[PDB]
């Protein structure tokens, strides 16, 4: 049954990880996947996650079965963390969440609820975008076309190039924005853009699929998700799929949700029901550890300020890596000027490297970096900064 | 765009906790779902559990990405629970083992992965099976068929009626089997008939899907994998979705797996690359807390016999419950005679209660049982004990 089956290929991103695992060189130094590091290149558990856990160790009686949609608490704390404390779409009861294994899961749950209880045929996503994308999409039998979006030589947004490329798009496609820190280029919409965005969808008639993964990384909790608030004002239906993995520090416990928003609160209600049928017949219900430990956090006002400050130092200390990278990379010879990676938000900036480069200093030099020339700016320590800003000078 | 959704049928499971969940009736008593209660009516975190959850708590450095296929020592653990130490599976690199969100991820990422990566159009399931069994495979674009199974006029598995039903079913289809405690029957083939059905199985050319979700609570962990060693004996390829939500007490934390078998090491690996590419689509990676917890118990000696030793406690606690069950109904003056009951195995009992019965136990009883008539005797106590015969009596 299985003779004739081929082997597929790597993944761009989480098979890097394989090779610089199989790797020997002594000096290696990886740049790939998206996860935060510190000064000491370690991705450590968060100071507020530990006492969250702590707790929980102590308090919990049963590990009895969760809802379908998981922990209400948790839902109820991602509401106001999206949409903001006092909106209209919780009072009007708009909203409903559905806790998730990761952002990931909250993709594919999105998906499949789309493919099978909606016309959705297509959904647009940005080029370029996060490659998995295009993998969860087919994956539930949608179609995936492509949007203009970033300008390589100006290393900027295209808006024109974005909103000309958009016209194609049907009346009931579903539109993929990225929430904040644009995944791989770093270059958000501004707040006019977002709002620009927000009308020319309702002219439209798109339907706005958010994924939204690293709220705080780019300027703040509530600045971050503005755009998205933007849309929410104007949107009768709206679908957020976010990630509690990099602002939690939480990436293998699988936290994430899937919010669901309609015109009224018996129309989100039905679509929900249909929404739960699809979790049923996927993983059934939503690991507790990870959700839990969110909600208590966010549900404590001691354990919320330890980890806002958590959060705050994630973000201050990769733009600190931002621009020691310029400056290191600009002594040491640099032909190019790769200053506009200083604009950049979020963990990566898109050095601009040809494949070719990429593949070398991984070869060569032993830094590995995503095909497209992604880097992980938050795995840069100044312990690393110079063997790794000599690699890319020798292969400029 | 969600106007039109139309609201989905409640699960007949999962739904009866929201009704449960509900009515303020004062002795009410829940048999539906099937997870383990103690004489007290709860069910606690095991004590193994929250041992091992003490050590992770202090000796966690990192919540960083696990891969695709989730803890190795886990999948390596996993593979000696199901064909047993030393088996030639495992020497001879036959099986590859993915780490998913409970029994209902294992079972839904291998019907993503044969519905992309095989010829597979057809799964066969017994009538009567576990419902979901249905919608996931459905939902991987599946046709579902049934074979014969139970004979309720005489309360026991009905071979001649399975096997001639099965002659329906073309090489190249797929088989589901429950490994033990058949759901919701409790009726499962003895070694032999599991011989005769493996040695068919072979000749008819099925490709063999086991469902395993109760190790250990038929009679125990080595011979409640009999059935599935013989067909491992036979077989070049197998699938196997196991689940450690019952036999470990993790309902919530989402722990299973998923084991492909085939008939060499080269081959096997070739089709895993394709069965982690559908997970990467899916949930991205595995959730760590539960997987982590059950391979720290696993990998330790003292954990280990503690473990066990809650496993028999538990599986011996229902044992009692039975037999109680059926005098307390007897004393009670049932009209029929319910000693079948004791000739079942794991946590339910097909009672033989018609729709109407069951539905009429809940309205005016406030006892809760599956539509089919399904109990959970694992949800029985000396205390609910009399009340609930009382109940059943009266509506027979
Ligand atoms: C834009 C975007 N969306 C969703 C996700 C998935 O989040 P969860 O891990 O919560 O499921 C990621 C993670 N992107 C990372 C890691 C990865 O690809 O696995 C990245 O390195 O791009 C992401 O970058
Ligand atoms: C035969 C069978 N297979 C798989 C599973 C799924 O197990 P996980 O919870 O590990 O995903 C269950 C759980 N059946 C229970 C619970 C339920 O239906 O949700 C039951 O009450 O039948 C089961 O009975």
């Given at each position: 049954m299985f003779e004739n089956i081929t082997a597929a290929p790597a993944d761009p991103i989480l098979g890097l990880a394989d090779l610089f695992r199989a790797?020997?060189?002594?000096?290696k130094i990886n740049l790939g996947i998206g996860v935060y590091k510190d000064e000491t290149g370690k991705t450590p558990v968060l100071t507020s996650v530990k006492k969250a856990e702590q707790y929980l160790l102590e308090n919990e009686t049963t590990k009895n079965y969760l809802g379908i949609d998981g922990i209400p608490e948790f839902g109820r704390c991602t509401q106001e963390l999206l949409f903001?404390?006092?909106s209209a779409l919780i009072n009007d009861k708009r909203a409903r969440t559905a806790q998730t294994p990761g952002g990931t899961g909250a993709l594919r749950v999105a998906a499949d609820f789309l493919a099978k209880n909606?016309?959705?045929?297509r959904v647009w996503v940005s080029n370029?975008?996060?490659?998995?994308h295009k993998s969860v999409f087919n994956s539930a039998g949608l179609e995936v076309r492509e949007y203009a979006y970033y300008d390589?030589?100006?290393?900027?947004?295209?808006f024109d190039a974005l909103i000309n490329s958009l016209?194609?798009?049907?009346?009931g496609d579903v539109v993929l924005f990225h929430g904040?820190?644009?995944?791989?280029?770093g270059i958000d919409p501004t707040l006019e853009q977002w709002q620009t965005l927000a009308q020319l969808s309702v002219e439209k008639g798109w339907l706005p699929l958010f994924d939204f993964?690293?709220?705080?990384?780019?300027?703040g909790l509530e600045e971050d998700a503005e755009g998205l608030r933007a849309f929410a004002a104007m949107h009768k239906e709206l679908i957020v799929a976010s990630s509690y993995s990099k602002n939690f520090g939480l990436?293998?416990?699988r936290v994430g949700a899937c919010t669901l928003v309609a015109a009224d609160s018996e129309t989100v209600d039905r679509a929900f029901s249909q929404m739960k049928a699809a979790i049923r017949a996927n993983y059934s219900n939503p690991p507790a550890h990870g959700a839990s430990v969110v909600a208590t956090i966010l549900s404590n006002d001691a354990l919320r300020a330890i980890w806002e400050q958590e959060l705050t130092d994630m973000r201050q200390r990769i733009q600190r890596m931002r621009q020691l990278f310029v400056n290191t990379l600009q002594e040491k010879?640099?032909?190019?000027?790769?200053?506009?990676?200083?604009k950049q938000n979020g963990?990566?900036?898109?050095?601009?490297?040809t494949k070719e480069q990429v593949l070398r200093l991984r070869e060569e030099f032993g830094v590995y970096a995503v095909?497209?020339?992604?880097?992980?700016?938050?795995?840069?320590?100044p312990d690393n900064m110079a063997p790794l800003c000599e690699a890319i000078v020798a292969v400029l």
């Amino acid at each position: 049954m299985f003779e004739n089956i081929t082997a597929a290929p790597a993944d761009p991103i989480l098979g890097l990880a394989d090779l610089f695992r199989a790797d020997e060189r002594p000096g290696k130094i990886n740049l790939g996947i998206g996860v935060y590091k510190d000064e000491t290149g370690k991705t450590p558990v968060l100071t507020s996650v530990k006492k969250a856990e702590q707790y929980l160790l102590e308090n919990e009686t049963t590990k009895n079965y969760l809802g379908i949609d998981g922990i209400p608490e948790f839902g109820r704390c991602t509401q106001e963390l999206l949409f903001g404390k006092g909106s209209a779409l919780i009072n009007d009861k708009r909203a409903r969440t559905a806790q998730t294994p990761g952002g990931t899961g909250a993709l594919r749950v999105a998906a499949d609820f789309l493919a099978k209880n909606t016309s959705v045929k297509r959904v647009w996503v940005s080029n370029p975008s996060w490659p998995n994308h295009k993998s969860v999409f087919n994956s539930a039998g949608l179609e995936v076309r492509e949007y203009a979006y970033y300008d390589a030589e100006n290393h900027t947004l295209d808006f024109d190039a974005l909103i000309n490329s958009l016209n194609e798009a049907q009346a009931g496609d579903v539109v993929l924005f990225h929430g904040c820190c644009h995944n791989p280029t770093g270059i958000d919409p501004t707040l006019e853009q977002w709002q620009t965005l927000a009308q020319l969808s309702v002219e439209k008639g798109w339907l706005p699929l958010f994924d939204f993964a690293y709220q705080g990384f780019a300027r703040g909790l509530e600045e971050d998700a503005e755009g998205l608030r933007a849309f929410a004002a104007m949107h009768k239906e709206l679908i957020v799929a976010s990630s509690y993995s990099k602002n939690f520090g939480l990436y293998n416990e699988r936290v994430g949700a899937c919010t669901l928003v309609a015109a009224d609160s018996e129309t989100v209600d039905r679509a929900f029901s249909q929404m739960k049928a699809a979790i049923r017949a996927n993983y059934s219900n939503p690991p507790a550890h990870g959700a839990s430990v969110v909600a208590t956090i966010l549900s404590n006002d001691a354990l919320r300020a330890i980890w806002e400050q958590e959060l705050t130092d994630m973000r201050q200390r990769i733009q600190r890596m931002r621009q020691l990278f310029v400056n290191t990379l600009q002594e040491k010879g640099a032909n190019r000027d790769f200053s506009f990676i200083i604009k950049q938000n979020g963990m990566f900036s898109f050095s601009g490297l040809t494949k070719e480069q990429v593949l070398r200093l991984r070869e060569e030099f032993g830094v590995y970096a995503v095909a497209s020339g992604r880097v992980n700016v938050a795995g840069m320590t100044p312990d690393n900064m110079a063997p790794l800003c000599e690699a890319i000078v020798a292969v400029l």
